[PDB]
């Protein structure tokens, strides 16, 4: 009966030295019942990455929606949408459904391809932008993620160090939440290569 915690799941994003990382777990459940172990919550539109936690039907719907909108954007503008711009589009689109919202906690991450700046942002279900230097957290284990991130994080981590830090924040937060876990994916994003790593974690 709380749509934001029927399916479960989490997303975390972090900035480093000339890089960003964004990670999610793979669980999709129906309350106590785990249903799928392959439900990824991170998508990309060109070089801009979007993670979405919350009600899985809305997660899927919003991905399909932002693919639609960024495809038309590209055709008309003749360039890939940038993270700062995509962030605004996410905000507009969610607030447009102000009194019948999508029950989601989106997170944007990527590098602006003109300025080279790493960029992350988070949103509430009705579109409020939370831009941050350091980290953004989302999902049913968000309290835990806030705790992990606030203690583990330090600025200017190298991509391979940032990887360890974001992974440890995700893993240990997931393990204190009954509705998150069942696998995890971490994206390390540099100006023009992106590595995707699947983490080994406890399957309970």
């Amino acid at each position: 009966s709380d749509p934001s915690s029927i399916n479960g799941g989490i997303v975390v994003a972090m900035t480093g030295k000339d890089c960003v990382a964004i990670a999610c777990d793979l669980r999709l459940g129906s309350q106590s019942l785990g249903v799928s172990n392959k439900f990824e919550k991170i998508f990309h539109y060109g070089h801009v990455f979007l993670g979405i936690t919350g009600l899985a039907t809305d997660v899927t719907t919003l991905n399909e929606m932002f693919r639609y909108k960024t495809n038309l954007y590209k055709l008309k503008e003749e360039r890939a949408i940038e993270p700062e711009t995509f962030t605004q589009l996410v905000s507009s689109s969610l607030y447009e459904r102000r009194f019948g919202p999508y029950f989601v906690g989106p997170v944007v991450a990527g590098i602006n391809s003109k300025s080279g700046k790493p960029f992350i942002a988070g949103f509430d279900l009705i579109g409020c932008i939370d831009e941050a230097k350091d980290f953004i957290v989302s999902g049913t284990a968000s309290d835990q993620l806030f705790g992990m991130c606030e203690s583990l994080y330090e600025p200017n981590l190298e991509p391979e160090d940032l990887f360890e830090t974001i992974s440890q924040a995700l893993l240990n937060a997931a393990d204190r939440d009954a509705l998150s876990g069942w696998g995890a994916v971490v994206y390390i994003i540099k100006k023009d290569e992106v590595v995707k790593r699947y983490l080994k974690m406890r399957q309970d």
């Binding site: 509430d124 279900l125 009705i126 409020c128």
Partner: peptide
């Protein structure tokens, strides 16, 4: 939804 967050408040201020």
């Amino acid at each position: 939804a967050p408040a201020x």
